[PDB]
Structures are given as C-alpha cells and as structure tokens.
Amino acid sequence: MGKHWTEKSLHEMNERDWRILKEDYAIVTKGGTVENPLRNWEELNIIPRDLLRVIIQELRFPSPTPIQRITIPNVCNMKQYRDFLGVASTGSGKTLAFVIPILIKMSRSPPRPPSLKIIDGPKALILAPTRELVQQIQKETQKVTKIWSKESNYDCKVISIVGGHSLEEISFSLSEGCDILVATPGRLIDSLENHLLVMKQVETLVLDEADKMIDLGFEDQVTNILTKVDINADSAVNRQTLMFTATMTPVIEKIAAGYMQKPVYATIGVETGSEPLIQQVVEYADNDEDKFKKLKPIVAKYDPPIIIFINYKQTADWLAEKFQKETNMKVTILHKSQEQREHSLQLFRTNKVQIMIATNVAARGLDIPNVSLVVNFQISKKMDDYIHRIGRTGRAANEGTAVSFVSAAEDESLIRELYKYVRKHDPLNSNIFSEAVKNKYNVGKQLS
Amino acid sequence: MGKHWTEKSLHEMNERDWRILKEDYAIVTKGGTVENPLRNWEELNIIPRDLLRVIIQELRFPSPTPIQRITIPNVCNMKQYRDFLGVASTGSGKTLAFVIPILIKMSRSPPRPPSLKIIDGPKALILAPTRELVQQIQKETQKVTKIWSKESNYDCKVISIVGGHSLEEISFSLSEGCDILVATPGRLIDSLENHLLVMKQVETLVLDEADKMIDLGFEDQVTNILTKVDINADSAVNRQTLMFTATMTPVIEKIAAGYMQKPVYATIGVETGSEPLIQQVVEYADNDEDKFKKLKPIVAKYDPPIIIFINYKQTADWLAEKFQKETNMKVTILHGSKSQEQREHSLQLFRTNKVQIMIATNVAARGLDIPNVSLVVNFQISKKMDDYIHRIGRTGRAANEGTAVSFVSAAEDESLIRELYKYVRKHDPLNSNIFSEAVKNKYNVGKQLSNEIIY
Ligand SMILES: Nc1ncnc2c1ncn2[C@@H]1O[C@H](COP(=O)(O)OP(=O)(O)NP(=O)(O)O)[C@@H](O)[C@H]1O
Ligand SMILES: [Mg+2]
Ligand SMILES: [Mg+2]
C-alpha cells in the first residue's frame, strides 16, 4: 500500500517523497543546503497574498512549473538571497521563475517613491541575448506587474533597452525611473557609456539563455557588465545573481565560479530542440547478400531520391552492380573517385538517377536534396556519422525513413549507443530496433 | 656642419634629417620599408589640388598633424596598398589621417551608380565603438564629399549605422547605396544578418579606437566582421586594413597578427598604457574643520593604508591631533625635515599597519617606497597639477581600484580648479568620477551647457 506525496501534508513528507517529487518534475540539484521544490503555490507562504491572487485568480496559473518549483524557494529567503544557476531550456515558465522572486523581494520593502526610482535606478537587471527575447521578457513581466499594480501598493516599472531605440528614446523612457530593466548586453553598454543610467541599487541580476549569449560573442560584454555593477554598487546593497542556460560549458563554469557565491545548481527537464521526423529502423543481416535481399523490396516502396551509405568503395561498386542487374533503378557512386562528382550530384538532384551510393568522406559538404529514405548499408564507426547520415532525410517537416543493416561484425559500444538513440529520438512513435540485434549484442533486454 | 631640415628641399633630405623630423613630431615607426612622413601637405603631390584646397581653406588645416604626417604616405603608396597600425590619442587628427586616403583611392575609379553601390556594398568600412565617434567621422567626411559632389560628378554617400538605428531607418539610409560606411560593430552585424547590405567590395577597412572597442567588449563582433568581410570579398578585391588605438595590448597585437599583413607600425607621442582605475572625487568645503568633518566618514570606510596630503606642516600637526581625538585611526607624519632613520620608521609603521594613515606635505613622500593605498586624500590641494597627478599616483597601482578625494575651499586659484575639472572629466576609466556642483558654482567651472539632449 502506502500514501502518495500528493496525499500528504508538508509535515508528513519524508526524503523518499522529496526524491520522487523531484523526479516527477525532472529537477536535479546540488550545491549543498538546497531547499526542496514547491509542492504548490500556497503552503510555504513564500508568495504574498496580493501577488498570489494575481497568479492564481487573475492569470489563472493553478500550479507552478518545474523551474518555478525549484527556483522560487531557493532564491527567496530573506536569510540568504542565495545565488542560483539553472540549466533549463527556453519556456516552461522560466521567465516568471525569476520575475516572481524579484517581485517578492520588492514587496518585502516599502514601495520606492517615484523621485527615488529616478535617482537610484533599477532594483533588478535582466540580460538576454536578443531584442526579441528582451521584449518577450518585458511583456511576460508586465503581464503580472500591470495587474499587481492595480491590486497592491507597488507600481512596478519595466523598461527595456534594445537595438533600434535611440539613446534619446531610452533616456525619455527612463523619465519616471525604473524598477526592472531588461536589456541586451550591447545596448546596455551603449547606455552606460553615454551615462543614461546608474545601477548602484541593483539587488537581483539575471543572466537568461547565457549559453546563447556566449555563442553570439557576448562573453566579454557580459563580464564587463557584471564587473561594472559590482564596482558601482552602493555598499549597503546586497546583490543576488541568477543564471539560466540550456547547456553547461567551460565558459559558463568560469563565469559561475568568478561571479557567483556558493550557488544552488539545478537541472530542470531535458535539453529541448529540433527532432527530425525520421523513422529509424535497425535490422540484423548476416552478410551483404542478406542485406541486399532485405533491401530490394524496401526501395520499391520509396520515392526517389534515395541515398545509401557504405564504407568501402568495393562494396559500393558491388551494390551498384546488384541494383543495375537485379532491379530497374539507376544509381551513381561517390568516393577519391571524382572531382567532377558534382555531375553525379546534379544527376541525383534532377532525378536522372534515383539512388546515390556514397561514402562519408565523399558526401560531407555536398548539398544533397531531402531524401525519402536513407539506407546505412554499412554502419559507421562513430555515432556522429550515423546522425549526420540519417539527417539527410526527415528535413523541413517531411517524414523520412532511415534503415540500418547491422551485421555480426560491428562495434559493440556503437550498437549500445545506437540502441539508446533509437529509443530516445522517436518522434513518429515508430522506431524499430531488431530483436536479433538485441540478442547478438546483448543490448536492450532489460525492462525499465 | 649641416642645414636645418625646414630650410631644405625634399630631395635634399638625408637620414639624419628624417630622424630629426620624426623626433620633432614624436613619430616612431617599425615594420620595414616605412615611407618618410610628410613635411607639409603640398610637396609630395599625394593629395590632389581640389582636395588639398578643401583641407586647407575649408577644413582650416594648413599643416598636417603627426599621425596624418606618418599615415598618409604609408597607406597612399602605389605600388603597395599597405596595412597600417597607428598608436595615437584622440584628438590627434586621426579621422583625416584615414579619410584622406579613402577619398584619394575612391577618386581613382569612376563613380558608381546607386544601383551598383547597392549590388556591391561600400568601398570603405569604418568601425568605431560609440555613436559619438561614428557621427563625428561621418560629419568630417561629409564636409569634403558634399563639395566633391556639388563641384564634380562624384556622388559619394557616407552612411552611418549605430545601435540606436531601427532596421527601417538603416534601410532608408542605405536606399541610394553607400560608398563609405561608418558603423558600430554590433549593429553592423544586425544589418548584415538581416540582409540590409552586402560587402563584396570593401577595399579599405578602418578600426578606429580599437582599444576602446575591446574594452567595451566588442572583440568578437569585430573579429566576426573582419572574417565576414574577408569571406565575401570578390576575388579581385585587395583589402587594405588600418587600425588606430591609444594604447598597445596583447589583444590588439593578436588582431594585427591574424588580420593584417606586414603592417607599418607607428606610435605618436609617448605611448601610455591603460588608465589606472582610480575614482576621482572633488568636493567643496568652507574651511579645514568642515573638511575634517566630511573626512571622518570617509576614512571610516576605506581599508588602510590611507595617505593624506597637505601643504603646511602646521596643518599636519593639527590633522594628527584631530585624528587622535576623533577617530580610532592611528597616524604618522612626514613633513620633510626628519632624519632618514625616522622617515624610514614612519614608513615602516605605515607599511606594516601599525598606523593606518600617513600625513604628508607636498614633497615629504617623494622618492619613498609608499605602499599602494586604497585612498588618497588631498586635504589642501597643491598649487600645481603636477603635484595633484603625483599624489593620486599613490592609489590604483597594479590594476587595483583606487580612490582619490580632494577638498577645495574658495581660496584656490580659479585656473587650477579649471585645469582640475578638465582633468577629472577627461580621465574617468570607471565613468564614476565626481566633481561637486558646489565647486562648479563657486568657481563658475563646468557650467557650459552642451545644447544636446544626450551629450
Ligand atoms: N505556473 C504556470 N502555470 C501555467 N501557465 C504558466 C505558468 N507560468 C507561466 N505560464 C504561461 O504558460 C505559457 C507558456 O510558458 P512560456 O513559454 O515560458 O511563456 P513565454 O513564452 O515566455 N510567454 P508567451 O510568449 O506569451 O507564451 C505562457 O503564456 C506563460 O505565461
Ligand atoms: Mg513560449
Ligand atoms: Mg575571448
């Protein structure tokens, strides 16, 4: 029997219950002395009644998202205002995961008079990599703050600073001061350089999609901003730093290490991203004859262009022979064979020829058209190559199929990786991984 | 003996004369096969008559500046359109130093019709860190190109792109084509990424105030642009690169290595490094008591060691008594007339924190091993700026953040306060320097309105 965590009250929760809840929302943490995630909005009383009413009654958000669950109780503690690093993909309530703590923090002090907002600048600074993201964050924030202003004592001003707005307009928009400022690093820097604003009173600094900011070349801009806010800070100000990234990198570690003080580290969900629409089908075949006999009826069912990958030029030639003499399909080869190979590609792109049989080397950096079918006649040594290969189909929202023949002579570790992959990336719910391959390589037998 | 270079024809100049001329304008060069600098605008006939007329009569520059002297003959040098790295301050006249060569180069081909400018993009691209500089550069260039356009068939469009510009506005600005594009790097990247222009034909690329571009954080954007320019160039396009900086750094060196080919290197004047990260604070005070009253909360918050400068020894004794009576800071005094033993004792107390505050008169601390201090206080400013600069030198040493606080009364020389305001406005690495309104009003200094919304 038992009693499930959703049936318990807070007191009754044990450590196994917390483990289960964390798994339930794919939250993984570390850093020591980590607060448990919210079970709901209400019970810890972290969120003040007015704000809570805005969230539950006005916006109708009955429950927190995972990232909000873990972020809010770790970032809201008058005790610590501890730093936070979250690894989570865009969306799923990330923005309010950090905007809610900023509001809570604001509501634990009397409202700043307007004149003071003008003299002192923002209490929160949010950095994001693009104008679009910045504007999206401002709107998502004002969604709450616009209502909150009508339902409480706080009149929160959200100003954004982005490319495409003159220094003059930025300066004008700052006329009634600012509580939360949202900016791209570049334009924020342009703004400081022209003395448009002071940031001596910033209590929460947020770095959102930090990996994307690094990717776009903003590392030095970001670290300059961090250093500048640290130096210019009023000494009575205590500043909390929050960082969100979809992935972890050496650069992100470097920044965390350099600018954050003993932070909570959390992973939330998995790294999201594009799923090619591919049916992966892995089948066992003893030798090249068996392979070809299984392949023949498959190609009969797929519209050209079709591509077949091999590893040895001899096998390519053999396979072309088989196709030419045993079906009515026109092929073309690719090694180390042609420099005018773009002739062949041109045959293929225009459907003069239906099947291309190519090695990895020969086909890398060629514009292959979207194919209906990839055949891995000989498996690659590296998963990188398998992924690049099968990527030749399933592009631009069309469905594709990738069939791979696995013999008795393949790298076991590779086959393990491939099994995991075929299970994990199954958007069409139709991926096949042969039981015979499972047996030959002792892989994928275990139940969940 | 020998006749002085100013008395000679160009063809009579020997190597010693060139050495002397270069020392006269503080020009130092390397990189091999460096051309001699201009002795005047006219001699060499590098600059065509109409353009020279504009420069002298219209822009009012009868003589070239040192950076112009060395830059122009090294980048306008058929046969080789050589790359160039100049180390020089604003405002040493850099702008014309690179604009003159761009125009001269432009004048060698027929004007392009707008449709073709659009198809191929600018012939010259100039990068600068701020809107203010980009707009300056565009204005200076346009003074010439306006004239060139009215008085000849050369329409030559000089477009600026800055961070503040919407894609709409950039589009409209680019709508009749562009010959010289002056841009901030981030926004240039946004423009390219949105297909607002191309860059197949950039023959001259100028990176102005490159050290500042790096300091603001733009190294990757600049690199990305250099790369894109080089990648999209037509085959027959030779791209000449000029880079100007106020200081030399390993990053600048690295960019020169990666993106320039056998450049001429030149330094004008005494090369300086980065500015000490000192915050300078100038504050008003009616008298000494009031100075001390403002000083109490200040020395309460800065970590020892702290150094305080005065002009008269009597003031040192006074100050020391007040520190003893009103603070918990212990002090040592150098007034100038103690033994080297005593002065070394004092200095030892100071270095080992047995005392927190050293009080020194104008030259009592010169030549001694004063540790880096967190705070320098000018209790009585010196009569001369040299001493001010020397004193604030005691802080912000070795890449540290430093603070210098000066109190002025109404008894100072007005010209000194004027110089001081200039110095405090000019040297503000941290954009945090404070020059009190009280001092401004009392001396009628720094009260000139800019007549600009932003500047
Ligand atoms: N706890 C919550 N419960 C329900 N919905 C929420 C919660 N938090 C946020 N949302 C909303 O769920 C939607 C999807 O989340 P998310 O993608 O993060 O928002 P967003 O993309 O930043 N804002 P938007 O572009 O207007 O959809 C948004 O409209 C959020 O405001
Ligand atoms: Mg969304
Ligand atoms: Mg770097």
Residue numbers in the entry:
A (entry chain B): 134 to 468, 471 to 583
B (entry chain A): 134 to 588
Provide the publication's sentences verbatim.
We report the crystal structure of a truncated ATPase-active Prp28-(127–588) protein in a complex with AMPPNP and magnesium that exemplifies a wide-open domain arrangement that is not poised for ATP hydrolysis. We grew crystals from a mixture of SeMet-substituted Prp28-(127–588), AMPPNP, MgCl2 and 10-mer RNA oligonucleotide. The crystals were in space group P3221 with two Prp28 protomers per asymmetric unit. The maps revealed Fo–Fc density for AMPPNP•Mg2+ in the active site of the B protomer, but there was no electron density corresponding to the RNA. The C domains differ by virtue of a large rigid body motion around an interdomain linker segment, 402GVETSEP409 that results in a 45 Å displacement of the Cα atom of the Asn577 residue (located at the end of the C-terminal α helix). We conclude that Prp28 can sample a broad range of domain orientations in the absence of a bound RNA and/or interactions with the spliceosome. The nucleotide was bound wholly within the N domain. The adenine nucleobase, in anti conformation with respect to the ribose, is sandwiched between Phe194, on which it makes a π stack, and Thr198 Cγ, which makes van der Waals contact to the adenine N6, C5, C6 and N7 atoms. The eponymous Gln201 of the Q motif makes hydrogen bonds with the adenine N6 and N7 atoms that we presume confer adenine specificity. The wide-open domain conformation we see in the absence of a bound RNA suggests that RNA engagement is needed in order to trigger domain closure and capture of the triphosphate•Mg2+ complex in a productive orientation by motif VI of the C domain.
Dissociation of U1 snRNP is thought to be triggered by the DEAD-box protein Prp28 (4,5), acting to disrupt the short U1:5′ splice site RNA duplex or remodel protein–RNA contacts at the 5′ splice site (or both). The 588-aa Prp28 polypeptide is a member of the DEAD-box family and includes the 12 conserved amino acid sequence motifs that define this clade of nucleic acid-dependent NTP phosphohydrolases. In the present study, we demonstrate that yeast Prp28 is a bona fide RNA-dependent ATPase, albeit with a low turnover number. Prp28 comprises two structural domains (referred to as RecA-like) that are splayed widely apart.
